[PDB]
């Protein structure tokens, strides 16, 4: 329209108050030190704790949280002025500065499920995992046009201006024009918190400059921004201003007493606690308890190295608890998501969905730093079979599509099972190809158990009785707290202790004189560490690792 | 934001009265001769080095950098306006375009500023203008080119990965009507344009007649056009990243210079393309100059002690330390790290073709080191064995959405140019892929009469092969040609074959458990009191050694020849599974390639004979 506002008092008051907030002269200059740091590091987004804003001026914080657009604009202008006051040249270089928000928000810290329409036009925080992204295209924000005929210049903010007043040609001044990058991604609540009963919520996220590469599909990020609606029926979008990252890291005293070795052995009873209604396979149970535990974090800055992502396969006869064991783990599963069979959504791939571009993160990707339970392995397509191989080796998933190239974290383990296609006994031929899995890459797995229905009448009596007794006319949560404690403990190895264990490793190899030994040194480390993690010890015990060797010893029969 | 007349005058003066004395120590009016040639159609492309502009106008250089298209058009117009004053005679009618241009000028003058009564500036050019990036602007990495640098003259480096063939692209489209008798011009800038229907001729403006017009290709201006995709140099891509591809469009005389797999330097204007939920656009680079080298045309003993010491003890000791031993095998990698880049210019391209083979992936987890070779080795790119389908190396025709009209793409061999090529999962490769490797052994004679493939791949890298054992470990009781089903003759073509049998050597196995802890356990990785140093500098130390270019001894060959006589007899007389043939001769000469360069003596060479032998002795009886 062109009508203008002359010196809005609210805007000027906001500018003065925010400038006073940034001018930390009476204090040591925490924000002023941050401003120097950002100028030195060539970054143009200042992150401000909301708690400080409450402390200095509660009314400002209340207005900011209740009114987003104008308050954010005013605070951005205040930051521009303060930076220019500290240094004019840095301000002259750049066009407009942006401000992000961090800290703790009382009522606005919501989950995608909780984030209903009621928080419209208010700054909110959303927590979850990225489920889709797109490539990084630039979107025009200020286009400058020059007309050689009329010697006039026209500028437009945000049908593209192509015609002058009298339809003269217009050759745009690209250099004077400003382009900023743009990216559209989406989120799901964490699996452990999102109920499986009711439908999921998806919230759109738009990233501005300095945020396209900050978050990648498959990680867990915190997004804070203005929640607006792009134009009866309106679609909700969230314009972000700060994104961080997560790093998936009152009964502690109750736990500590459980960890005392003087009373009883906690490991032995714990192993039976996970497969309550399955008789036998106690050695199998110990392995399954091992799979949950184990270290998955190494001091890897800007690179990669040996990892704990090794996984356990289960092959056996139908109705022989092979299918059920997955379910028991899935139920009391920490940070674990189920997927099975075909999974026609790209089990480990983004598939680059068309007709929208979306990159639907797959099952193994959305399960970062967890355990993946997969049933009916042979049901997976050959493409998945080829694809799934690459995940376990380097620890990353590579996807190469039409222009789309991606890096995905694959810090994952697999508890997979499949029926022996048609094989019923599967003892004459080596399982390496008899289980339907074609490649010899099966050797990469940690373990391969065979649960055949061997003619063992003595066991057959106990199996029948065990089913019937389970009615229980007259400890799930305990294991959940256990895994959390071991997650922050790194039971470092001692070479002096390890030496005695390693001595019998050769004797394991020599058993064939009287199915690969060359990898076994890898699985010995993880299994031995797992035993110590149960005891919360920071040092690996000789007795603890000895049971790991026996686990290996009975691992190959 | 300036008066354009003043800038046009400034560039006019700058072009008219600048010179140099580098031309044979003689002032030759550097730009003046080029202008004279352009006026006489003796030169098609005009290059303006911004360095000369900076010698007396740094602010003009900065203004040009801030905005490239506008100053480019301004310079084009200035050159066009400066040409006519240099005309001396009648046009000698170089091509049809000059004929049409001279008739147009003659007819316009025959009828001796109206906004729509003049020829478009691009139609009467017959010259092309480009900018060479000023030396002040440091080269930028492709990942760092974002939306914030749109419209800025930038320079980026990379490797050509997808180049189409030269095709004509239309600048000005010529339309003629059957009633008007005039010429209608429609400049075309986007890759898509809409043909005209109603002529805009002034005569029809009065009559509002049908004015049905027919497009013609006679007097239209055409310029050359190409599509090339460029990917980041692998040496500067972080290990936790992947290289990215950015599209580059080259036009005019600048075409027909890039070849696949070649390192190029590109300078141009970063502009968006529309393709007719927001305002979406892509990015490309309109190149202006692709540059080769100019200088290529034609050490005290008190500071360090590096060259006197064998590299087998020094270079090996700080490369791939996590490897569980097997240093003797690692020695060949040192030969592989050397390669055959230093070759005599006599057509011996096979020097860089080292087809090394390894059998057994589960063995001591050596499958890990294969990836490590590509990353650390410079001038080499990461390669995968069976990481995709068969479309990744060959070419086919499918549907497209963004662009691509029967475009040509390269394979894994082209991906690593004159470097180290790593292929994994050899067994999983199909027979068609297996023949493709075998075709490289035939000294690059790729002629195919099939519609989709007619290329000649520049296979100058080094092929590294890792072979899984076929559904079981090597059988001592069974000899070759019976236990392995693939013909030995196919494997015989390979120069070097390596297999590791995991023997129950308990003493050696003891070392690994202690050795496996040390990695990422402490900061003393080179245990032999080596200073930690910067990781970047380790590669640079290697580069200066390659630049020395020492000379191998020719007389040394005759002495080794006498040794070969005994070696042949004992090898054949054994009649065991291991056997040699004339192919050994290639290996022996190839052995001296890395061995003799290291020793910078140039007085007496004797030790190389035993050193060359010692490399064969480990290869001998390797089983």
């Amino acid at each position: 329209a062109g009508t203008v506002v002359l010196d809005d008092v609210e805007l000027r008051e906001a500018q003065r108050d925010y400038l006073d907030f940034l001018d930390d002269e009476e204090d040591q200059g925490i924000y002023q030190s941050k401003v120097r740091e950002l100028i030195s590091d060539n970054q143009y987004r200042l992150i401000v704790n909301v708690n400080d804003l409450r402390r200095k001026n509660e009314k400002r914080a209340n207005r900011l949280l209740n009114n987003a657009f104008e308050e954010l604009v005013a605070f951005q202008r205040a930051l521009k002025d303060f930076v220019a006051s500290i240094d004019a040249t840095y301000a002259k270089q750049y066009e407009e500065f942006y401000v992000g928000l961090e800290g703790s928000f009382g009522s606005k810290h919501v989950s995608p499920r909780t984030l209903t329409s009621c928080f419209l036009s208010c700054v909110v925080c959303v927590e979850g995992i990225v489920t889709k992204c797109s490539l990084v295209r630039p979107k025009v924000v200020r286009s400058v046009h020059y007309c050689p005929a009329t010697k006039k210049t026209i500028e437009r903010r945000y049908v593209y201006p192509t015609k002058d007043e009298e339809n003269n040609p217009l050759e745009t001044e690209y250099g004077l024009s400003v382009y900023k990058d743009h990216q559209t991604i989406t989120i799901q609540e964490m699996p452990e918190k999102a109920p499986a009963g009711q439908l999921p919520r998806s919230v759109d996220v738009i990233l501005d400059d300095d945020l396209v590469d900050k978050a990648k599909p498959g990680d867990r990020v915190q997004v804070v921004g203005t929640y607006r609606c792009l134009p009866g029926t309106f679609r909700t979008v969230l314009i972000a201003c700060n994104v961080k990252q997560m790093s998936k890291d009152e009964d502690i005293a109750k736990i500590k007493k459980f960890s005392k070795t003087r009373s009883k052995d906690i490991f032995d009873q714990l192993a039976k606690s996970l497969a309550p209604s399955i008789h036998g396979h106690d050695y199998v149970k110990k392995a399954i308890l091992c799979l949950l535990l184990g270290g998955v974090e190494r001091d890897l800055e800007n690179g990669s190295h040996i990892r704990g992502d090794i996984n356990i396969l289960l092959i056996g006869d139908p109705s022989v608890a092979k299918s059920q064991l997955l379910r028991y783990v899935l139920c009391t599963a920490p940070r674990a998501i189920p997927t099975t069979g075909r999974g026609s959504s790209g089990v480990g791939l983004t598939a680059a969905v068309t007709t929208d571009r979306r990159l639907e993160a797959g099952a193994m990707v959305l399960a970062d730093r967890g355990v993946v339970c997969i049933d009916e392995f042979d049901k997976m397509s050959d493409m998945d079979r080829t694809a799934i191989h690459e995940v376990m080796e380097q620890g990353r998933v590579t996807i190469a599509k039409a222009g789309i190239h991606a890096r995905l974290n694959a810090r994952c383990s697999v508890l997979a099972a499949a029926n022996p296609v048609y094989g019923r006994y599967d003892q004459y031929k080596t399982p390496m190809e008899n289980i339907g899995l074609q490649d010899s890459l099966l050797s990469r797995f940690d373990l391969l158990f065979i649960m055949l229905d061997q003619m063992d009448p003595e066991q057959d009596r106990e199996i029948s009785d065990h089913v019937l007794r389970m009615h229980r006319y007259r400890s799930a949560a305990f294991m959940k707290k256990y895994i959390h404690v071991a997650k922050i403990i790194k039971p470092v190895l001692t070479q002096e202790s390890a030496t005695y264990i390693a001595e019998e490793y050769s004797r394991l190899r020599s058993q064939d004189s009287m199915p690969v030994t060359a990898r076994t040194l890898e699985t010995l480390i993880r299994l031995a560490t797992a035993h110590a993690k149960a005891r919360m010890s920071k040092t690996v015990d000789l007795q603890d690792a000895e049971e790991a060797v026996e686990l290996v010893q009975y691992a190959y029969f | 934001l300036k008066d354009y007349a003043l800038e046009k005058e400034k560039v006019k003066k700058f072009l008219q009265e600048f010179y140099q004395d580098d031309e044979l120590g003689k002032k030759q009016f550097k730009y003046g001769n080029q202008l004279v040639r352009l006026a006489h159609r003796e030169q098609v492309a005009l290059y303006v080095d911004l360095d000369d502009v900076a010698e007396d106008d740094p602010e003009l250089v900065d203004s040009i950098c801030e905005n490239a298209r506008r100053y480019a058009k301004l310079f084009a117009d200035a050159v066009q306006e400066l040409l006519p004053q240099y005309k001396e005679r009648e046009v000698v009618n170089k091509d049809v375009l000059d004929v049409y241009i001279e008739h147009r000028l003659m007819m316009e003058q025959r009828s001796r500023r109206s906004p729509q009564n003049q020829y478009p500036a691009e139609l009467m050019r017959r010259f092309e203008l480009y900018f060479q990036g000023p030396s002040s602007n440091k080269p930028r990495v492709i990942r760092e080119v974002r939306a914030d640098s749109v419209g800025k003259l930038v320079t980026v480096r990379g490797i050509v990965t997808r180049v189409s063939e030269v095709k004509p692209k239309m600048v000005v489209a010529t339309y003629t009507c059957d009633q008007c008798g005039a010429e209608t011009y429609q400049p075309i800038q986007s890759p898509t344009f809409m043909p005209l229907i109603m002529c805009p001729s002034q005569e029809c403006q009065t009559n509002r007649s049908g004015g049905r017009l027919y497009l013609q290709t006679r007097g239209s201006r055409f310029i050359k056009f190409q599509e090339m995709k460029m990917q980041e140099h692998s040496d500067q891509v972080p290990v936790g990243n992947i290289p990215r591809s950015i599209t580059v469009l080259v036009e005019g005389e600048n075409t027909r210079i890039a070849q696949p797999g070649d390192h190029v330097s590109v300078t141009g204007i970063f502009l968006p393309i529309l393709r007719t939920q927001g305002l979406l656009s892509e990015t490309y680079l309109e190149a202006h100059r692709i540059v080769k080298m100019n200088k290529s045309e034609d050490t005290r003993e008190e500071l360090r002690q590096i060259a006197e010491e064998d590299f087998y003890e020094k270079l090996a000791a700080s490369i791939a330390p996590e490897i569980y031993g097997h240093e003797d095998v690692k020695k060949a990698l040192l030969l592989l790290l050397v390669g055959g880049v230093d070759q005599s210019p006599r057509g011996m391209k096979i020097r860089g073709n080292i087809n090394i083979c390894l059998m057994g992936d589960p063995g001591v987890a050596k499958s890990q080191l294969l990836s490590y070779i590509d990353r650390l080795a410079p001038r080499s790119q990461y390669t995968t064995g069976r990481g995709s389908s068969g479309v990744g190396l060959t070419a086919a025709v499918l549907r497209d959405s963004v662009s691509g009209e029967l475009t040509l793409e390269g394979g894994a061999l082209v991906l690593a140019d004159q470097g180290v090529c790593c292929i994994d999962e050899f067994d999983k490769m199909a027979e068609a892929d297996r023949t493709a490797i075998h075709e490289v052994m035939e000294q690059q004679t790729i002629s195919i009469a099939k519609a989709g493939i007619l290329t000649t791949l520049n296979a100058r890298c080094s092929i590294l092969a890792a072979a899984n054992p076929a559904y079981g470990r090597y059988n001592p009781r069974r000899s070759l040609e019976q236990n392995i089903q693939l013909p030995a003759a196919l494997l015989s073509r390979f120069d070097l074959l390596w297999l590791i049998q995991d023997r129950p050597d308990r003493d050696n196995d003891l070392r690994l458990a202690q050795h496996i802890t040390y990695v990422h356990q402490h900061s003393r990785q080179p245990p032999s009191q080596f200073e930690p140093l910067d990781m970047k500098l380790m590669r640079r130390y290697i580069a200066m050694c390659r630049e020395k270019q020492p000379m191998v001894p020719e007389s040394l060959a005759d002495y080794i020849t006498a040794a070969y006589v005994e070696m042949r007899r004992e090898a054949w007389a054994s009649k065991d599974a291991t056997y040699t043939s004339a192919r050994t001769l290639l290996a022996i000469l190839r052995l001296s390639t890395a061995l003799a360069r290291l020793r910078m003596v140039d007085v007496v060479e004797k030790e190389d004979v035993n050193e060359a032998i010692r490399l064969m002795e480990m290869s001998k009886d390797s089983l």
Binding site: - | M107, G181, P272
Partner: protein
Amino acid sequence: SGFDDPGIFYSDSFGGGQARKSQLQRRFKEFLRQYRVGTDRTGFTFKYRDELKRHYNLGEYWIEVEMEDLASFDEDLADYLYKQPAEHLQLLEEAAKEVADEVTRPRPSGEEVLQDIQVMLKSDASPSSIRSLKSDMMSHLVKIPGIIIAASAVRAKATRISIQCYFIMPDKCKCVDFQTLKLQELPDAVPHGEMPRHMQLYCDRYLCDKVVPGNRVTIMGIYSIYIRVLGIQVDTPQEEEEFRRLAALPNVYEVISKSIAPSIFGGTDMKKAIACLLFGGSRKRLPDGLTRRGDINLLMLGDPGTAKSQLLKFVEKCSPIGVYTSGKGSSAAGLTASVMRDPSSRNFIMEGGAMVLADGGVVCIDEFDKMREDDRVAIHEAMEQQTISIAKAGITTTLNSRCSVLAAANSVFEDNIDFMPTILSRFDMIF
């Protein structure tokens, strides 16, 4: 660069159901430049070179084209043009610009822009009567003469409109002159007993104000619905031998007298004067300054009861020039050249007057005393100075009102003076 879009460009026209108009455009261009007229005796020079130049020097911005020159040099060309000039008229106007093109040539810096030129067309053909202005003759050039009764002031009318890419800006549009006139056919063409017809006129850039009400003018234009006026012209032996014999009769005075007035009433002397008025006197043009009245007027007074009612109809039947009124006239048009106020913005309404119409003749004034006092203050002047004046605030225009006066009214009931002891001196004592 997929966003921008340069314009469409057309070159010069080098090389060379809906009929092509280009050839007609050329024939206009060729004729205007190359045509020459003149005689050998006065010498040969390009007469239009300096004559047109003087026209542009005086700022006329208009050039006159006589069709006679086109007919005389080549009659075949001229015949074709008359058929459908309406559409081709604009093309002719455009061509005139190119011709100027020619001798303008060097324009003194500040005459850089060559302005539009309007061309008016005239013919010496005999005008047709208003009977020819029917629907059959639609969209053809006409020639109708007449007398102009109504005139409007200069207004503004827009030729081409402009929109905003929101108020319409008139400053970027170029407007032209505009005048509104009402034309009345000459009495001779009008039937004996018939209300005279009326036709509105629509002028152009230079047709405005070149004619004033009451002049005898010739209108030339295109009929369409009103006359798109293109040109207006201001005006300045066997039958004689028969007239001479009638004139030479010594007793011709008497015999006319009894013919005009039936012998039912009135003296022969009374009849004798009437014929004198019909001839009228002579307007002697003094060489020095003011001219002379030279126009006698007769006022019919006396006692009533002389069969006056039959006189009113008889005078209508016999008057060569004159107007029959119904009571106190019609609408707001009075007996003098008065003006009125436009109901819309009070722009201009020049209603004219009866005495204007009969300039040069006589007007049959009936119910003379019954006219209003407002017009009287003016009617005194015109009856003496043979011209009516407008007594408005700032109108000084004095139309030509030389008409003689024939006032018929009931006599007023130096002893016979009611309110105008000056008008009587200006008439004759007639029974």
